[PDB]
Amino acid sequence: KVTTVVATPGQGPDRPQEVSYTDTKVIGNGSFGVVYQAKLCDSGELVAIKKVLQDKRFKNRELQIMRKLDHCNIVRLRYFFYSSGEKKDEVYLNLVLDYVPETVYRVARHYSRAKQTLPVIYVKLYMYQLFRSLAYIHSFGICHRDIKPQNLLLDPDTAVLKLCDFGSAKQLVRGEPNVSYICSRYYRAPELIFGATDYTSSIDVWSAGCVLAELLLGQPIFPGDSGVDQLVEIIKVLGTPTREQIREMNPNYTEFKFPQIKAHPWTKVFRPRTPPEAIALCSRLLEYTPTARLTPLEACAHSFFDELRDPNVKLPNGRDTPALFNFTTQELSSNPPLATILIPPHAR
């Protein structure tokens, strides 16, 4: 049973084209719309088709962002096409993405159910690739705004990670207000809770930090029952912020007096067998002061990731590591001196 559509390639020509696919099955639902799995007739390759209700005459942000992106750690947009329901003006936008069988969420949960901590090698590998994809999108001023384990796709054989769901993503423009109620609660940066509209892409680094901590703990570090409770959970670890940190998070917020709680020591937040380089990295990501957080490229160059730069490293499954050092100049744009750490001798 072949479905055939005129679709437009994700990158390159812009000239439309006939695209055929088969084996259409539902893999995901939600308020966003629907995601299907399907097989391309033309080459057998598996694809995910994200169908979203879209109102012309309006620009879809997700589409425009996805057309810019070509990166090994980002889910690739192969095609897009529009389709109609049958109820007059009922148009759908369809993103044809590369299919990826697993997620960081489902892999972590598998280990958690089997009463195991995820092996540290996988923690290094997943996080490294996340930061690499963040460095890439951030170099275009794009902020993902929804970093969380469910959004990190995984090939279980190769351990390739691909960032997906750009449905909250936005090209940030300094000076132009952005909405505060954004991100999933557990991964939501404290400046967002404080109502900031002048935030930067360092909100993704906070979220990345929450993913790191979660992989080490076997569960979310900040599991708030609500928006207010989310800050409570953060305070149980970071303590209350200083007047200076508050100003850094949201300069349009002031609180003259509040009772001080002290930070909980980072080495007590994690279990004793947690690698100290992992804790060290975490403490540089989960900071109140948005500018005090590591950049994604600085994060890639952290000592926690040194094992990945060793010529001898192997996956527990026996395979070689995926491509880790093939940095383009675009990728290194924000900080060239880091190439010295980031590209190891044996890879030049």
């Binding site: 609500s226 207010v228 800050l231 002031t254 509040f258 709680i261």
Partner: peptide
């Protein structure tokens, strides 16, 4: 609704500490 009000009124931190000591 509630977070929004605490932000605008400047009572967020105060209210969060109180909830932590319950």
């Amino acid at each position: 609704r509630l977070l929004q009000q605490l932000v605008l009124s400047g009572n967020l931190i105060k209210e969060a500490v109180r909830r932590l000591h319950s």
